[PDB]
Amino acid sequence: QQVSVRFQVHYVTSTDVQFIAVTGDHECLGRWNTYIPLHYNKDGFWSHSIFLPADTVVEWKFVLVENGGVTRWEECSNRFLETGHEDKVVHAWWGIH
Ligand SMILES: OC[C@H]1O[C@H](O[C@H]2[C@H](O)[C@@H](O)[C@@H](O[C@H]3[C@H](O)[C@@H](O)[C@@H](O[C@H]4[C@H](O)[C@@H](O)[C@@H](O)O[C@@H]4CO)O[C@@H]3CO)O[C@@H]2CO)[C@H](O)[C@@H](O)[C@@H]1O
Ligand SMILES: OC[C@H]1O[C@H](O[C@H]2[C@H](O)[C@@H](O)[C@@H](O[C@H]3[C@H](O)[C@@H](O)[C@@H](O[C@H]4[C@H](O)[C@@H](O)[C@@H](O)O[C@@H]4CO)O[C@@H]3CO)O[C@@H]2CO)[C@H](O)[C@@H](O)[C@@H]1O
């Protein structure tokens, strides 16, 4: 079974070709090699909903992406997420567990 998790972070980019994405240790998160782009909303928020395996534990990070690759990793250690089995929002602050 799957669960829908909405990731959200505030980040002001400098140019229109940069964007924020999520990556992590699960296949659904790119296995640290690829990333899932977030989308920009009103008020400088980046948000997107990702389907994750239910009732498990995954490690992940926000990344900043430009010209096809990560130009900046979040400076904290890997974050842990208990995915649960109810749809939910994970609001985070860049660089802070
Ligand atoms: O064998 C492959 C490894 O795969 C996994 O490692 C992951 C890490 O868990 C992830 O966190 C990420 O690593 C990023 C890291 O998050 C990021 O901060 C950056 O680390 C740099 C850092 O800028 C700086 O301190 C510099 O000195 O070097 C650091 C490490 O290179 O970049 C890292 C990625 O390059 O992704 C890696 C895999 O790419 C797994 O957990 C490991 O056990 C495994 O060895
Ligand atoms: O003592 C620690 C720090 O305390 C204070 O920092 C505050 C900021 O003032 C707050 O605005 C917020 O910071 C957020 C920020 O709002 C959010 O946009 C994002 O910042 C990005 C930035 O948009 C982007 O352009 C790029 O430059 O990187 C930034 C992150 O590195 O995330 C920030 C936090 O992750 O909260 C912090 C406290 O956590 C004080 O102003 C700092 O000088 C001080 O170091």
UniProtKB/Swiss-Prot annotation:
In what way is this protein post-translationally modified? Ubiquitinated, which leads to proteasomal degradation.
Domain CBM20 spans what residues?
Answer: 1-96
Q: Where in the cell is it found?
A: Preautophagosomal structure membrane; Endoplasmic reticulum membrane; Cell membrane, Sarcolemma, T-tubule
Top-level taxon of origin:
Eukaryota
Annotated tissue distribution: Expressed at high level in skeletal and cardiac muscles. Moderately expressed in liver and placenta. No expression is found in pancreas, kidney or lung. Present in skeletal muscle, heart and placenta (at protein level).
Domain topic, free-text comment = The LIR motif (LC3-interacting region) is required for the interaction with the ATG8 family protein GABARAPL1.
Assembly, in brief, is: Interacts with the ATG8 family proteins GABARAP and GABARAPL1. Interacts with several glycogen-associated proteins, such as GYS2 (liver glycogen synthase), GDE (glycogen debranching enzyme), GBE1 (glycogen branching enzyme 1) and EPM2A (Laforin).
Q: Its biological function?
A: Acts as a cargo receptor for glycogen. Delivers its cargo to an autophagic pathway called glycophagy, resulting in the transport of glycogen to lysosomes.
Q: What is this protein called?
A: Starch-binding domain-containing protein 1
Q: Which organism is it from?
A: Homo sapiens (Human)
What stretch of the parent protein is included here?
262 to 358 of 358
